[PDB]
Amino acid sequence: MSEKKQPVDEDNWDDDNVEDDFSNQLRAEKHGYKMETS
Amino acid sequence: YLSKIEELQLIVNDKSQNLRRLQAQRNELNAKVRLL
Amino acid sequence: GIISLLDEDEPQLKEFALHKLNAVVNDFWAEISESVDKIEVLYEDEGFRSRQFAALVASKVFYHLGAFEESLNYALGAGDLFNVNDNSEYVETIIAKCIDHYTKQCVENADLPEGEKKPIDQRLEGIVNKMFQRCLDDHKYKQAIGIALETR
Amino acid sequence: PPPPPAPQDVEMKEEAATGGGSTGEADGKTAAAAAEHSQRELDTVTLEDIKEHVKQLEKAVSGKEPRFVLRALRMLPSTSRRLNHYVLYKAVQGFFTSNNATRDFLLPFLEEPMDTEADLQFRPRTGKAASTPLLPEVEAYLQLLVVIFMMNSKRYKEAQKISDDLMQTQNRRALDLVAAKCYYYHARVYEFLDKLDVVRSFLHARLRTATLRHDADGQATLLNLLLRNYLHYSLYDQAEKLVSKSVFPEQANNNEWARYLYYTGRIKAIQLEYSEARRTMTNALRKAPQHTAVGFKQTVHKLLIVVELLLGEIPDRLQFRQPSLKRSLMPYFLLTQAVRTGNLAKFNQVLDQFGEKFQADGTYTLIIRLRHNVIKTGVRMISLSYSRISLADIAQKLQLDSPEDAEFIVAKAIRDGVIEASINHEKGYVQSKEMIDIYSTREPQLAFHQRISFCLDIHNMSVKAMRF
Amino acid sequence: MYEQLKGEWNRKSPNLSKCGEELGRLKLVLLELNFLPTTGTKLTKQQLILARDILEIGAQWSILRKDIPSFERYMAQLKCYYFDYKEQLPESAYMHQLLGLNLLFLLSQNRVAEFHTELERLPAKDIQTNVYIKHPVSLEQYLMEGSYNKVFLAKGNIPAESYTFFIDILLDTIRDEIAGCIEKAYEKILFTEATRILFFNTPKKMTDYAKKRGWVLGPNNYYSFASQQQKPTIPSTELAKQVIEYARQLEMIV
């Protein structure tokens, strides 16, 4: 039931929660360019 | 009203007497299984 | 916040606080529950000559919070205008518990030979002999002998 | 004229059960509650809330309410002939001409089952006669010639409060069960126009009268009314629950208690709480009854886990997301993304982008501590990460620019008690540690008392439920 | 009508008890008038608009005489002045900073939820405007952000009609929260971190701290104690008694 006030109102989808958890890390060369940085 | 409400509700509490009826069923089952 | 307006140490601003009480006490049921202590201050003060009304709103707020033996204490402390009421919630439930204490007290003192009792506090017996006359002069004496059951 | 036979059928199926059957279930019954037709009738009220009720349009106008409210009489055993009258009046809608006799002519129609005869003695038939006509009138609030009549119909329901209070007998386990619903609709129709003012004292004294003599499903439901009253308007009398916490019934309706704990979770959320508020939000969350009502958990869940957003330890919440809620959580998805991100310009640009939906929430408590939540997310992550970090590393990794406010951060984090981390006091430069080898053996078996004592509590509860 | 109510209008303090003469006049206002049961007809509330005015000025008297029961008294009067059901009043003059007086007093006495009912009673005038409120609420964000130096950055400009006593109590809630938070779980501080977190380089008040909290004033050096934790050995028999009542509760039930 919803007898309240509220009546007023996998391809990547599976990997999507991790994607937004991956949305803060080098999304996808500077990794590999760091090789020649030193 | 003034002093006439509580024992009516006490007889209502004979659902506990119905609990005794349930335990009576129980001990019936047990006594007769033991008879077996 | 209606009790901080009481630094005037006479009853003459306690009366304005009570004129606020009997106006909006049901809205301010949240407010008096902290003020239980100063209602005690009003009951303890014999110079506070409105201590009848102190015990009145004391039994009111304790009827709200669900205190019942202290509702009995300050129900006896409420005075002579206490029993006379004809209201259908407050006064009849608390005189129900009060004369329930009267009959269990008369049972315990009927279980207590020759005195050494708890004496009649000075605001019992009111609706005993006043609603008893309702039962008598309503010309059916079954309550009039039911009290004789209940007192032993 | 072929569809109105379906209200003709369900109407008689309702008041057959209600009138005759629950009157026979009121005569001598109700050992605890043998009025099973009361719960049957609340099921049919949910059925009239699924469907159109009886006569909102139904291809005609105003057929059943002038019809069936006559002639109940409760007499000599040929009152099934008055039921035969009720049944064989149904040639009027199919064959004859329908005429308008609702919402205007109802004012003597309600007085007809009293002015026929001394019908019967019990109030659930009176609550029937003022509820089962008038609840089919409330859900059409188009505010033109319909809402003043909801107003007067629930003034007759205030007369039903009067005839609930002075009716001669535990008929409150029918009338409070109907009155929960209809007093919610009271609050609805009263607050479709303005805030309700003396209806507050109506509700107060109505809570008072249901105190001990009949304390069955009235106190908790009227307290939901009072709670949502104090919720929709200014917030002064939550100290009333802090001083008069009498909120514990049998928790009967099994969803009333759930949403009750939800509403008081919003209360403790807006008073101040993380822990107790999030655990009663969690208990109401897992005490969601079903999903048989479309998308009604969803907006209320958006406002439910605001405190879990305020924890900072929340991931994206997407498992709840109705796709019809997506176009409304276009702010809220990026808001929990702003919880996962530590950006400051995005922390205020989500606000600068969605302040109107944040006002639709209307909770400033989230943004008054959500920056502090961002810095506590930072301190939880990095203080769980490294043993002896420096305050400069985390500080100028999160743009603090000075040692002394990083000192105040670490100091108020010790004051908030997450990690041991102290300062190698010369100019800052934290000397600290993590905490493994804290304890692992006698400390579980401290909590295992609560584990298995909770288990044996539920054992005895299943015993007292096996009793039924 | 009733001219002499205004007898203390514009000079604000020649004494304490001439304000007591005004207190007797407001006592006669309580005899004759009694603002709360007065329902409507809003010309019997215009002398109550005057009462709102001169009792805002009486709240200014309450901060002038330092009386905190009188402060909470007249502040609960103002709280009731926004509470009586004729909300359609002339717009209150000291409205912006009576909320600020109450809020900064609350911030001084360390409350935990009346802060948020303050954030709920009038939220819409907090972010857009009202520096008497807009400055304390972001100031609270800065206080529990991690800066007791935003205190002095702010005290650059906060008299705000006698918040001076309350920001002195705010200095007090700096210093006794230093008395707590000076070594909660610290190694050790020295004279200079006392000089940074504390202020007023050395009075007899940080010396009073070192001789008042049970403190070891080390050689230009500080320690909470010689072990800082009072050294934190039988977890068995108390849980054996727990086993007694635990087996007991598993008994009597099936």
Resolution in angstrom units: 5.7
Residue of chain C nearest E27, judged by CA positions: C13
Q: Do A1 and D290 touch (CB under 8 A)?
A: yes
- Produce one character per residue of D27-41: b if its CB has 16 or more CB atoms within 10 Å, e if not: eeebeebebebbebb
Q: With CA atoms as reference, report the closest residue to D131 among D72, D71, D53.
A: D53
- How many CA atoms lie less than 13 Å away from D216 in the CB half-sphere? 15
Are there at least 3 beta-carbon pairs closer than 8 Å between A and C?
no
Q: How far is E121 from chain D (nearest CA, A)?
A: 6
Residues of E in contact with D419 (CB under 8 A): none
Q: With CA atoms as reference, report the closest residue to E115 among D358, D235, D261.
A: D235
Residues of D in contact with C26 (CB under 8 A): 201, 204-205
C-beta separation of D57 from D49 below 8 A = no
Measured CA to CA, the distance from residue D56 to residue D66 in angstroms comes to: 14
Q: How far is D107 from chain A (nearest CA, A)?
A: 29
Residues of D in contact with E137 (CB under 8 A): 368
Are there at least 3 beta-carbon pairs closer than 8 Å between E and D?
yes
Residue of chain C nearest D202, judged by CA positions: C26
Name all chains with 3 or more CB-CB pairs below 8 Å to chain C.
B, D, E
Q: With CA atoms as reference, report the closest residue to D354 among D369, D341, D378, D337.
A: D337
- Residues with Cβ within 8 Å of D424's Cβ and at least 6 positions away in sequence, in order, are D430, D431, E187
Cα D412 to its chain centre, rounded Å, is 38
User: Where do we find the tokens 């009304």?
Assistant: C53
Measured CA to CA, the distance from residue D412 to residue D403 in angstroms comes to: 14
Task: Phi first, then psi: give them for residue C19, nearest 5 degrees.
Answer: -70, -20
Measured CA to CA, the distance from residue D63 to residue D155 in angstroms comes to: 23
Give D 107-146 residues with CB within 8 A of chain A: none
- Residues with Cβ within 8 Å of D144's Cβ and at least 6 positions away in sequence, in order, are none
Measured CA to CA, the distance from residue D246 to residue D236 in angstroms comes to: 18
Q: Do E69 and C7 touch (CB under 8 A)?
A: yes
Q: Do B19 and D467 touch (CB under 8 A)?
A: yes
Sign of CA dihedral C94, C97, C99, C105: negative
C-beta separation of D37 from D25 below 8 A = yes
* End-to-end Cα spacing for chain E: 81
Measured CA to CA, the distance from residue E86 to residue E52 in angstroms comes to: 13
In this complex, the residue of C7, C20, C23 whose CB is nearest that of residue E73 is: C7
Residues of B in contact with C96 (CB under 8 A): 2-3
What would the two tokens of residue B36 be? 């077996």
**Apex CA D41: angle with CA D40 and CA D42, to 5°?**
95
Measured CA to CA, the distance from residue D417 to residue D397 in angstroms comes to: 22
Q: Which of C2, C3, C4, C31 should we substitute to test contact with E (largest number of E Cβ atoms within 10 Å)?
A: C4
State which approach was used to obtain the coordinates: cryo-EM
Residue D365 identity (one-letter amino acid): T
Measured CA to CA, the distance from residue C58 to residue C49 in angstroms comes to: 15
Q: Do E70 and C23 touch (CB under 8 A)?
A: no
The answer to whether residue C4 neighbours chain E at the CB level (below 8 Å) is: yes
Q: How far is D333 from chain A (nearest CA, A)?
A: 11
Q: Do D300 and A6 touch (CB under 8 A)?
A: yes
Residues of B in contact with C99 (CB under 8 A): 2-3
User: Where do we find the tokens 């002195």?
Assistant: E168
Measured CA to CA, the distance from residue D236 to residue E14 in angstroms comes to: 38
Residues of E in contact with C24 (CB under 8 A): 36
Name all chains with 3 or more CB-CB pairs below 8 Å to chain B.
C, D
Chain D interface with C: residues with Cβ < 8 Å? 200-201, 204-205, 208-209, 211-212, 236-244, 246
Name all chains with 3 or more CB-CB pairs below 8 Å to chain D.
A, B, C, E
Distances (CA, A) of A7 to A3, D52, E57: 8, 16, 49
Chain D interface with B: residues with Cβ < 8 Å? 31-32, 213, 467
Instruction: Return the H-helix or E-strand segment holding C44.
Output: helix C36-44
Chain length of chain A: 38
